[PDB]
Amino acid sequence: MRCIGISNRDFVEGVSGGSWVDIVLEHGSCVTTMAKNKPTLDFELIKTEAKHPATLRKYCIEAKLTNTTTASRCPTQGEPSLNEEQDKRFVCKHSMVDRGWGNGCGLFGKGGIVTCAMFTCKKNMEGKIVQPENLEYTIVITPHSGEENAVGQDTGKHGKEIKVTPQSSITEAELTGYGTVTMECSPRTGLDFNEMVLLQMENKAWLVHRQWFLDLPLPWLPGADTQGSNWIQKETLVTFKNPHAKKQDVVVLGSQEGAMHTALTGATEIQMSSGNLLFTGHLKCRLRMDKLQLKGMSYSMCTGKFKVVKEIAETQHGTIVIRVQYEGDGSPCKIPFEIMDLEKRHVLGRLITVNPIVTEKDSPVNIEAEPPFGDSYIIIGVEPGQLKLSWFKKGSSIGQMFETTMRGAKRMAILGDTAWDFGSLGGVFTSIGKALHQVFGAIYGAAFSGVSWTMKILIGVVITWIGMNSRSTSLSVSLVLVGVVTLYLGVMVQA
Amino acid sequence: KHPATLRKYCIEAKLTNTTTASRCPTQGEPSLNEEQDKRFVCKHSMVDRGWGNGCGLFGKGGIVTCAMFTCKKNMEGKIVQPENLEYTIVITPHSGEEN
């Protein structure tokens, strides 16, 4: 019952003819799956460890110049020569300074001058790369029925942790009283590692784009260096001064840590103090409900009295969780829980904690249910001692549908075509929508890559105006539709 | 001459004593006594709260975090009064005499 507290919780209801459902386990989001006659399960992606990343490129963010030297030639005598020019760790530049009799030359003109200073690196930002091979996810599956505590079992916990690495596609988790859940996850397509750099500057690490990382204008080493002195592109971290065309000087151009922090705007930070832990990105899995059994089936109904040990609480997703304790005979029995209307003539509310049961006499099992909008009754127990607890659900139905549509749009924005594999059970509409989304998303990524959200909004407004003014209505509708989607993406981007 | 500093800018800061205070949902924003200390930088946000977190209500709980801001390096912007400029000029007669 982890998902209760999480604001980003999605309810996936239904399984295919084969009793499988595919889901996307995003980081920081909890998924709860409800299937008829099936235990309700809570899936959370809690970790993404990338192991043994190989260094790709070292960048210099803070250098220091030393051993500065200068050589001059009299005018018309070519360029001077510095022995330090042969060495590649000296940054050198050629310029011309006015010469004459006063400065020791027999000709009045511009003589060549060369300034060389030894370039040294104080701080560098390694950028490492991982191959999907050593990309190990971690998922927690918690049987959503029971009581939500991690101290019930000394050896472990009620929830199970399964590590989804690319080596094994099938990961099978055995729940103590619920059978086994099978996840056929696909780690290779979750996040496009090997098109992505694990940038690590000092004690902070990010997850940057490989092309962006390789386009950074800083001194860099290949990444396989051992001496670590032959920096490439040194002149990006050095200034040469020839102020009055009289002498030339070279300065080190300060430290680039803060500028790099500003540059990393828009990159999701990660952890590298131990193991290169990533807490971002999604994962696509298929659920195997076939071997999942309800924990408390083949119990007799509880006929005793029930008391509410915890006041009914309205969870953020429109459900209610109530903790009740059983005081009656027949310890291991199944709780009679119902949600009806004010006349007690209909069962209006659905039960998220399907098949609530009393495992132990003195154990406060907690129940999550979805009541209907408006006034209702939460009834627990049989008629002698049955609890009627009135509830009012604050919202409306149409508002909930609007919210669900907006949530689906936000999923289509955060995720790519995977938004079509979040709730799908196969089917031609899902497949066709996914294919069309793939085509339009390829076109949109080609068109809008590397553009800020402000530019996306500007382009959306421009396209909307063009469509609004188009004389052909087919083109007009298409253009306004594209512009509206572009505006929405601009508003929702910068997540 | 006689430049007077008008402003010091911090170019390399440091955060040392981080403290945080959390409030349960529908109870408003929390309070830190460091929040009205001027040498502390603070920010208010909302974190998910619930039974696991220890609240008893399900919603967004106000959160505040504060760290002490310390400057390790600064850049002094100085100003000079126009009366304090002293230009130096050299007048050499183009005579042809040697040193």
Add this chain to the structure above:
Amino acid sequence: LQMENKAWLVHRQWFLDLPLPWLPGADTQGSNWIQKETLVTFKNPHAKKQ
């Protein structure tokens, strides 16, 4: 404008419009930096911690 070991002659409005923490210049103690938020970042991912 004197930074660490180097100095520049800069416009005064440009200098007063820089996005960095600043003391008024008469503060010997340096315990009241202004605009401290331009040199720190507050991160709240997943709405779980800050």
Add this chain to the structure above:
Amino acid sequence: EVQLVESGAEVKKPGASVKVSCKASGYTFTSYAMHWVRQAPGQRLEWMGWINAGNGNTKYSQKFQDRVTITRDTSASTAYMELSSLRSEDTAIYYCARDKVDDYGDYWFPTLWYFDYWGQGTLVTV
């Protein structure tokens, strides 16, 4: 289940440096965060602070935030609490407890059973 064994009682002169280890077995050390509780003989339990074994993050009490330092070994499977400036008030038995951190290694909010397991106790008479 899980077991935590603290060190033997130490009698020290006031002002000396104290260091008492609490090796905890039966569970992933870096998974849980280990707290330190002090109780003067004949007085209440008194919370010093916690050290997270996952990443070394620590928190000390207002009272102890100057002379009290907590460090742990991930490999040695032990966490150490050291008191800097000893005093007669500091003559108490110091108890090490444990609380599990979240799935992300952070220790923002504790588990409701935040002191489910303790140590037998180490007595220091300053």
Add this chain to the structure above:
Amino acid sequence: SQSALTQPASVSGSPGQSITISCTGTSSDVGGFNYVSWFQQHPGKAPKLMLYDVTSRPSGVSSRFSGSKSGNTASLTISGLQAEDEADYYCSSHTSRGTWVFGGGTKLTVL
């Protein structure tokens, strides 16, 4: 910080009866957060967690121990006092500032 947790210094009850221990604290820790935990400490023994939540208790602990919290006060209720209930009981809470406050402690003595 400070022992905001204030509970009766001395408590006694006849064997077999029901005795309650009340722990009071500020609205920061015990009035706002359900982290009220009750710990029993025997002579020369380390504290043992009795109720980790306001009312929840560990597997080992018997069901005679039941807690409650109303307003800023937390109450430990023991039903059917035995001769093995003569230990001290320390309430604790997770303060809103992230610290831990223990109660003064109640020494239970049975007649």
Add this chain to the structure above:
Amino acid sequence: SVALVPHVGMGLETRTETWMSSEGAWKHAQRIETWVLRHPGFTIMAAILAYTIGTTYFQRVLIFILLTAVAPSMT
């Protein structure tokens, strides 16, 4: 410098919040507004140029917006 080429449009954006998303969402627009305030002269000239170069109110407004946004960034 590196700060002039940020990582904002990379397309690697999950539901998790990025490095300085909250701070940097409006930094560019704030900086353009501050620049217009400090340097009013160029704004009027840009308005006149956009009016002259645009036959329609859409062209004029778009051109003026582009000129105003480019001038500070171009520096």
Add this chain to the structure above:
Amino acid sequence: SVALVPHVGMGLETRTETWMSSEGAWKHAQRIETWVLRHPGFTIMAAILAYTIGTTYFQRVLIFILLTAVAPSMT
């Protein structure tokens, strides 16, 4: 950041070498070149938008260059 307000256009310019003049003369233009190389998709759409917005040939090129300059520098 502070690097986005570079003090380039503030007058006060003598006949003496200013800070990072030769380096920083074309660095923005080179940045735009690299960005257009890395993101050719946006350039095509910007050209199409410029062509469809504005009737005269001069107008279209003015819009295209303005958009391609704003895009990378919008940050």
